[PDB]
Design a protein around this ligand. Structure first.
Ligand SMILES: NC(=O)C1=CN([C@@H]2O[C@H](COP(=O)(O)OP(=O)(O)OC[C@H]3O[C@@H](n4cnc5c(N)ncnc54)[C@H](OP(=O)(O)O)[C@@H]3O)[C@@H](O)[C@H]2O)C=CC1
Ligand SMILES: NC(=O)C1=CN([C@@H]2O[C@H](COP(=O)(O)OP(=O)(O)OC[C@H]3O[C@@H](n4cnc5c(N)ncnc54)[C@H](OP(=O)(O)O)[C@@H]3O)[C@@H](O)[C@H]2O)C=CC1
Lengths: 518, 68, 135
């Protein structure tokens, strides 16, 4: 229902944005609960210390997983933005939810009379049990506009001072009419705001401060203003106002069960996922989390240098971008000509802006001296991580009109270049983790008039197979027709990159991929 | 990244006369109009048209995945 | 400076403020203009911006306001000074103190004044109605 890009901050993952809060141990062994923009559902999280609280001695790690998001948003909305003062009256929609419970806890500490809206009698009973200060006249219905009448009656028709709204459409319109003079409206929902629904400006005649509350802005900006909320939450923890919520724990394997349980919407409190059980000891100073088997995909270290031969080519530019999204930051493209089109210039400018250290080379991999120079440049950047060979020179035509010069021209980049790369790698590249050559099904299946192309591609496969017989990395991918940049339909670039991600982990030497026609 | 499609526009102006006056023919027989996009001011002005306050929302990919 | 002045009778200040602000916008708007001008001024806001409204026409007519602005942390205020005379005196003492401190610190300077005698009150009203007075 929510587009992945709607999350603030450029991620480019298009996935793994799940998770905002966590409770676990630290790099030193200290119990900590944190708040992260995304990627909270993992066995490890990389976070700055500004977004971590210590877990007091009474609390268990399970309880701590419920505090961060809800209490941070509650404090930010009420104290930091709404500037609540003792004795006020406020309407907290959806009291049973996490943010509603946090707001009630913060308000009841100040002495404010509270109206809350709930969707069932079980939630009403749960909130009555949780907060005995609440009376029988502090509950309305959250599935209809009947709370407007309830509040305008039990408040004498004056209204409420703060309205922490999470409801949308008519219920949001109904909540505005509950405001009193000098009231404040705290909008923590995002449906009406996204749709740009109109808000009648008459309500502002009686002094009304309509707020837009978004906690996400802190996680990627405004660090100076975050410390106020952090300190407020810390003070609440020490004073006892911040109380953990009910937890419905699910194990790491049954995360889908947790997601379906949340989808049904019958939960009261917070839903937690137990990645790893808590040890009795206060500080464990442990080494690593317990190993769990998971789908393997390709990621690259930041300190390694990568080489793409013929990288200014349409597949080569697209492979480079794919690598950059996987953490590559030291890249060495090679081309006989150089940057000679607007597309290449745009891409390289963008990558250099993003901080990646792109470097273009004219070193021709065919000549052994050229290969050694290319590896020397890569080493200058950093230890050589991978070597990709996407170079191609085509001289098509039936065998009747071929010449030895054409075969040499076609085989110089693919055969000779691959041999020289292999030799220089076996000599002076001890950290190499990838070695890929891009071939064509014309080698395997066969095609008419591409005899020299087929000879050039096939020789690459032999070298890759020999390399994998000595333990060194090697791989050859037999593609069909690349689409965006035989009887086979052209294969889209996205599908190609997905398949390639699949291939880099397999144990085999030569692989293939194509799309059959009709 | 991803295909963003228009969802709102705040103001569009079309003045056909100024449009016909702005067009200048290239060395070929083709008629062309120069375009400028100001992401600071939120105006896309080209020829005799003036788009202001465009908004585009991400649309989910159809995942028809016709290629297997 | 020469870049701090725009035109009030047109909606050309939106482009001026946006250009000289780098497209970020402004952090606080003290607005008293009409419908189209008001909508123009709303688009000058930046993230965590604050819109101070001291006019009455768009509020009295209950003109619509697109809520898409609040996707940022914009805060919209309805500022009326009459409410102090009817209640919230404890809130008025704060403003009283602020004005007194401004007076004693030198910030609060008097404005340019045009004097009309009691007998010529009608002339004063006509003069202010024309719209050429400064001060
Ligand atoms: N402004 C911001 O940036 C932030 C936004 N928020 C908002 O605060 C609110 C509470 O967040 P959170 O702490 O996660 O609380 P929950 O998501 O647990 O709150 C859900 C509540 O919504 C109502 N509800 C109705 N149908 C369903 C359903 N099918 N599933 C779940 N709830 C349902 C219930 O209240 P009832 O019993 O009355 O039906 C329930 O208590 C959300 O609207 C969230 O978007 C949270 C923090 C920051
Ligand atoms: N797209 C397809 O149809 C398929 C591709 N392949 C193979 O996969 C790879 C994908 O690249 P592709 O899209 O074909 O690239 P191009 O079609 O753009 O051509 C190869 C690229 O590499 C450069 N290049 C060629 N020879 C050399 C050389 N000796 N030294 C340095 N740079 C060189 C070229 O630039 P310049 O001319 O300036 O050197 C060009 O940018 C190729 O190796 C191709 O053979 C196989 C199966 C399917």
């Amino acid at each position: 229902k929510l587009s992945p890009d709607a999350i603030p901050g450029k991620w480019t993952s298009q996935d793994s944005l799940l998770g905002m809060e966590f409770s676990g141990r630290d790099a030193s062994g200290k119990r900590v609960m944190g708040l992260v923009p995304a990627k909270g559902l993992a066995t490890s999280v990389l976070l700055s210390p500004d977004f971590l609280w210590d877990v007091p001695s009474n609390w268990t790690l399970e309880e701590a997983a419920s505090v961060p998001v809800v209490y941070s948003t509650a404090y930010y909305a009420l104290v930091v933005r709404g500037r609540v003062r003792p004795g006020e009256t406020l309407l907290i929609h959806s009291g049973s939810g996490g943010v509603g419970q946090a707001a009630i806890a913060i308000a009841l500490s100040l002495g404010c009379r509270v109206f809350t809206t709930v969707g069932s009698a079980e939630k009403r009973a749960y909130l009555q049990a949780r907060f005995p200060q609440l009376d029988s006249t502090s509950f309305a219905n959250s599935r209809d506009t009947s709370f407007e009448q309830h509040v305008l009656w039990h408040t004498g028709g004056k209204g409420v001072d703060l309205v922490l709204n999470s409801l949308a459409e008519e219920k949001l319109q109904a909540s505005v009419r509950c405001l009193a003079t000098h009231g404040r409206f705290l909008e923590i929902g995002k449906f009406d705001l996204s749709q740009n629904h109109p808000l009648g400006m008459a309500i502002f005649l009686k002094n009304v401060t309509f707020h837009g509350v978004l906690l996400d802005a802190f996680f990627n900006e405004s660090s100076a203003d975050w410390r106020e909320v952090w300190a407020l939450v810390q003070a609440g923890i020490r004073d006892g106002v911040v109380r953990p919520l009910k937890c419905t724990v699910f194990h790491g394997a049954q995360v889908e069960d947790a997601f379906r349980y949340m989808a049904q919407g019958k939960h009261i409190g917070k839903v937690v996922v137990q990645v790893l059980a808590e040890e009795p000891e206060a500080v464990l100073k442990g080494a690593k989390p317990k190993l769990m088997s998971a789908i393997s995909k390709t990621f690259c270290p930041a300190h390694k240098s990568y080489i793409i031969a013929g990288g200014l080519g349409g597949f080569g530019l697209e492979l480079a971008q794919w690598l950059i999204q996987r953490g590559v930051q030291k890249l060495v493209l090679t081309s006989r000509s150089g940057i000679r089109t607007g597309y290449q210039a745009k891409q390289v400018r963008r990558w250099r802006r993003q901080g990646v250290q792109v470097q273009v080379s004219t070193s021709n991999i065919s000549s052994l001296e050229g290969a050694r120079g290319l590896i020397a440049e890569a080493a200058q950047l950093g230890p050589v991580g991978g070597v990709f060979n996407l170079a191609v020179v085509l001289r098509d035509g039936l065998l009747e009109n071929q010449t030895p010069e054409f075969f040499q021209d076609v085989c110089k980049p693919k055969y000779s270049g691959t041999l020289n790369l292999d030799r220089v790698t076996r000599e002076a590249c001890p950290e190499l983790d990838y070695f890929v050559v891009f071939s064509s099904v014309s080698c395997g299946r066969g095609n008419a008039g591409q005899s020299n192309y087929g000879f050039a591609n096939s020789a690459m496969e032999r070298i890759c197979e020999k390399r994998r017989h000595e333990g060194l990395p090697g791989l050859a991918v037999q593609w069909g027709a690349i689409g965006d940049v035989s009887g086979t339909l052209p294969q889209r670039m996205a599908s190609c990159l997905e398949v390639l991600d699949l291939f880099l982990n397999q144990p085999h030497m030569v692989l293939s991929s194509f799309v059959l026609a009709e | 990244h991803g295909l963003y499609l228009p969802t709102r526009v705040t103001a569009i102006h079309i003045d056909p006369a100024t449009h016909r006056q702005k067009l200048y023919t290239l060395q070929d027989k083709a008629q062309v109009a120069d375009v400028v996009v100001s992401r600071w001011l939120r105006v896309t002005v080209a020829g005799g048209v003036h788009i202001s306050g465009l908004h585009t929302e991400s649309a989910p990919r159809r995942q028809q995945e016709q290629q297997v």
